[model samples]
Target: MQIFVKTLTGKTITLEVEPSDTIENVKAKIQDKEGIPPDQQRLIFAGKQLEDGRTLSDYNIQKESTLHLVLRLRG
Candidate 1:
């Protein structure tokens, strides 16, 4: 399945992954794509937070669904 992650900067990143992949796995992919720390990234789908302990399948993320990516600035 394909996941869409739209950033705070108005950029949309397409990630090809399986539904069984964990949310953290997606974070790693995003980190590699944009140089952001995975731990510092927050993924929201349908206005709800995506937890690391859950898989994309758990969230029932569809192919056309675009998950919002929020950057958490560290002090």
Candidate 2:
């Protein structure tokens, strides 16, 4: 399945993910493509926060679903 991810800067990227893939797995992919570490990424879908423990299917995420990615800034 494919998912759409939008960064805070308004850049959008497409990700191919498995139904059984965990949120953490998605984070790793994002890190590889976006250079943002998993620990620093905050993923939100359907206005709710996504937890690493949950699978993509557990959230009922479908193709073309938009995931908002926010980067955590450390001072």
Candidate 3:
């Protein structure tokens, strides 16, 4: 399935993903694709922050879902 990840600045990107992929691992999906900082990677969907060790299905992420992306400022 696919999902759109929009940067805080409104740049949007889509990832072709496996249903059981780990959230942190998928951070790698947008990592190089969007040039995001892994340490600052944050994904929000439906008002809830997706934590590590979870799958898309854990959040019931539907097909064509849009995952809001936020890259916290580098420390």
Candidate 4:
């Protein structure tokens, strides 16, 4: 399945992923493409935070769904 990821700054990235893929897997891909560490990535969909251990299917994420990625800044 393909999903759309929108960054806080309004950049959008398209990714190919499986429904069985965990949120952590998506975060890893985001880290690779955006230079944001997995731990610093906060993924939100439908106004809820996505958990690392949870699969996309767990959240009912379908093809073309848009996820918001917020990069945490160091204090």
Candidate 5:
């Protein structure tokens, strides 16, 4: 399946990963690809956190799904 991800840096990256990939793995991949800090990465799918070890389908994610990731910046 294909996953479309948007970074807080205003860059869009598309990843082709297995349907069974967990949210944690996705975060790691995003970090590797976009240099986003894993600890600061907050993935919101349909206004909810894509919790660790949860499959995309478990979170009701579909093919060609778009996931929004926000980076928490300390004030």
Candidate 6:
């Protein structure tokens, strides 16, 4: 499955992952790609936190469904 993450900076990142990829994996991916801390990464899909241990398949995330993520940084 593929996931698209659009940033507030107008940058869009597309990832092709397997069904086993959980929300934590996605968060780690984003952190690796965008240099954001994993704990600081907040993935909001359907207005809820994409918690760990929850796979996209578990959430029934469809193809082309935009999973929005908000990265919170600490000074």
What C-alpha lDDT values do all the predictions have? 0.90, 0.92, 0.84, 0.91, 0.83, 0.79
All candidates in order of lDDT, best leading: 2, 4, 1, 3, 5, 6
* Candidate 6 lDDT over residue span 1-75, tens digit each: 787887766877887777778888888788778888888888777776678889988888777767777877777
The C-alpha TM-scores of every prediction are 0.92, 0.93, 0.88, 0.93, 0.84, 0.81
Give candidate 5's total backbone clashes.
Answer: 0
Candidate 5: 10-residue stretch with minimal lDDT:
6-15
Tell me the tens digit of each residue's lDDT in model 5 across 1-75: 888997666876897778888988888888888888778888888778778779887887877888998887786
Q: Locate the minimum summed-lDDT window of 10 residues in model 2.
A: 4-13
Off by over 4 Å in 2: none
Segments in model 4 whose C-alpha atoms lie over 4 Å from true places: none
Error of 3 at 34 (Å): 1.3
Q: What is the lDDT of residue 15 in candidate 2?
A: 96
Rate residue 35 of model 1 by lDDT: 92
lDDT of 2 by residue, 1-75 (tens): 899998886888999999899999999999889999999999999899899999999999988899999887888
lDDT of 1 by residue, 1-75 (tens): 898998996977999988899999999999889899987899999999999989998999978789999987866
lDDT of 3 by residue, 1-75 (tens): 888887776766989998888898779888879777667888999878898799998889867998888777753
For residue 31, model 3's alpha carbon misses the true position, in angstroms, by 0.7
lDDT of 4: 0.91
Whole-model alpha-carbon lDDT for candidate 6: 0.79
Query: Using lDDT as the measure, which candidate wins?
Result: 2
In candidate 5, which residue pairs clash?
Answer: none
Q: Which digits, one per residue and each the tens of the lDDT, describe model 4 over residues 1-75?
A: 999999876877998999999999999888788888888899999899999999999999999999999876787
Looking at model 2, residue 56 earns an lDDT score of 93
